[PDB]
Ligand binder design. Structure first.
Ligand code: NAD
Ligand code: NAD
Ligand code: UPG
Ligand code: UPG
Lengths: 309, 308
């Protein structure tokens, strides 16, 4: 069976590729290496260094390999970049998705499994925590609007053509291969700076709450979505909130870092609190996180240590 | 004062241009003539035959003319077509809007007035009519999804840069210069068929209810949104529902058409009923329709007779 993984050279996508390869699937990867890395690629997967919004190239790849599933992880994944360049962001995030969906219909894809976002979708005025999928989306960033627009297009493709899909709205994903450089998640930034004994910055008062979910658990969610959760949207998170202050403390203890954090002005656009309810994923996908935050942070620090040897 | 009107060679946009010119504004028009027509263009406007999604070209236009207001009417504005090539549709409908908004932010535009849609945004299970802006959006067509995505981006630009905007969600717009040969626009199709004595087709049972709003009234709402209704979404419609069968009868009486309609199979995706509550526009824009349907249909027939 052939499987297409877009964004397979990236943080989450490369782990998805590895797992599919391990389970015996034929895997085809599309990635333009805008943020992904050649080192992340699996030598057993077929690789196309190409862009998802390239209609002729996507036409060619789908016609050759007729993937039965598409795992769509390719995205402009930085919120800050989406703010600075919203048209370019939407070209990858919306138009890119629509090209893949057009080819998926044309070439008989059975199911499209889309990586979406929990944090950038529910908006800034949520009152129910942990937050369920029944909360109406109010995205405020271009990234969140693009992800939400694409989820709506998925429902269109299901209604019009009978394409099955699953949307996975991730919380804050962290772990090995997350890039600590550029537009990085705080786990990777903190871990790398602490190991190097560099200064660590906390924005605003550090009381921002997030739901940190380990990359291996997110990969398992993707695989469970192959045969379950048809035409459903799921939060993929832990339902546990952690402030940036608490996170710094955990990582400081693990790394043996011995400096205080430097408090900096608050970051524009930061939602105050994000925690996801995963009851639905538990009931319909049989999904639950297996790696606690403390276990996950230790694994993460361990991977980064090896990079520094 | 300079004003940019995108889609200014189209049905609604050409009338907006006319009204601005009449009121003494300098008007720049951007239209790629994908569905618009040179014959619609006001010769007093400065015309760029260019595409809104062209960043380099929009850079030049905004940099040169520094428009104070943008009336954004350019769209792949037809619901069929959006279904078969949604990526191409979203390139005009979403990416195009985003390019205009980036340039708007960069070159100090004061207000952006966006043409959106009522019907295709509220979706197919509405229970309250006439329908207020508080009704939760559930667009299921690529056209409605794209329009709604753009509305959401407009709020981002307002929050991030202080750009002021107004969204006008039109009902079913009809009147002079609506193209009777395109995908849609039942009023223009019926009028052209009837005046030519050709067959007239009613899809399904003809009991589909729409809210027909005259183009000159839609133009007045655009102009009222220059100074009022900052950062608000408004339904622009009449609050009155008309079946296709009723529309047929009205236009048959006006044209003197002497045939019965030919019924065809129902058209896939047609919502059963769309009627918009315009109370919010009435209060905040001071807007109301000045042209009743009967009066507007007569003006439309009047115009079509002259034009073919
Ligand atoms: N905490 C998180 O990391 C998080 C949270 C919520 C959602 N997500 C989503 O999960 C997916 C993967 O995220 P990630 O953390 O691994 O980021 P990532 O940057 O590491 O992976 C994205 C990959 O997509 C590639 N890419 C970007 N544009 C492309 C294009 N036009 N054509 C082909 N490839 C392109 C990049 O090169 C990159 O390898 C994304 O959809 C992202 O939005 C991630
Ligand atoms: N007519 C209605 O009943 C109705 C109802 C709801 C919303 N609207 C909206 O009002 C606006 C105008 O509608 P209309 O009836 O006048 O349609 P229209 O097709 O006559 O006008 C659209 C104009 O935009 C131009 N255009 C399309 N793509 C372009 C691009 N990429 N770059 C530059 N120009 C481009 C077309 O050439 C055309 O002249 C649209 O946004 C439409 O979606 C119309
Ligand atoms: O050096 C740093 C970096 C981050 N933060 C704080 O850490 C928190 C989390 O930031 P970040 O790691 O950037 O996560 P989010 O901004 O929440 O982004 C998450 O949410 C995005 C939008 O939902 C996802 O989709 C992203 O991939 C995901 O990492 C925020 O409060 C930041 O203020 C710091 O204090 N110091
Ligand atoms: O020959 C025809 C043509 C249309 N209809 C019917 O007329 C009604 C109105 O159709 P149409 O004129 O195509 O408009 P709509 O489909 O309602 O709606 C669109 O009107 C504009 C396009 O014409 C869109 O952009 C607006 O968003 C949306 O209101 C529908 O019930 C059709 O079934 C007929 O019966 N016979």
């Amino acid at each position: 069976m052939n499987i297409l993984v877009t964004g397979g050279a990236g943080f989450i996508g490369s782990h998805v590729v590895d797992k599919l390869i391990e389970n015996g699937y034929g895997v085809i990867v599309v990635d333009n290496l805008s943020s992904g890395k050649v080192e992340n690629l699996n030598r057993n997967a077929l690789f196309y260094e190409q862009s998802i919004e390239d209609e002729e190239m996507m036409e060619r790849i789908f016609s050759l390999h007729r993937p039965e599933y598409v795992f769509h992880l390719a995205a402009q994944a930085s919120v800050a970049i989406s703010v600075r360049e919203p048209a370019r962001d939407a070209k990858t995030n919306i138009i890119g998705s629509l090209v893949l969906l057009e080819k998926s219909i044309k070439y008989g894809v059975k199911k499209f499994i889309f990586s979406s976002t929990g944090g950038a979708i529910y908006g800034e005025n949520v009152k129910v925590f942990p937050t369920p999928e029944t909360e109406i989306p109010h995205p405020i960033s271009p990234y969140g609007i693009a992800k939400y627009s694409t989820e709506m297009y998925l429902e269109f493709f299901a209604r019009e053509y009978g394409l099955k899909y699953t949307v996975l709205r991730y919380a804050n994903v962290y772990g090995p291969r997350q890039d600590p450089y550029g537009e990085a998640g705080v786990v990777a930034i903190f871990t790398e700076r602490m190991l190097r004994g560099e200064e660590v910055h906390i924005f605003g008062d550090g009381e921002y709450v997030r739901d940190y979910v380990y990359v291996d658990d997110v990969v398992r969610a993707n695989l469970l979505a192959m045969e379950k959760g048809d035409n459903e949207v799921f939060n993929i998170g832990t339902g546990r909130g952690t402030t940036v202050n608490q996170l710094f403390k955990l990582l400081k203890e693990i790394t043996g870092y011995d400096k205080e954090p430097v408090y900096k002005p608050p970051r524009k656009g930061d939602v105050r609190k994000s925690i996801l309810d995963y009851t639905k994923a538990k009931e319909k996908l049989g999904w639950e996180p297996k790696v606690s935050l403390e276990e996950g942070l230790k694994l993460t620090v361990e991977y980064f240590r090896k990079t520094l040897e």
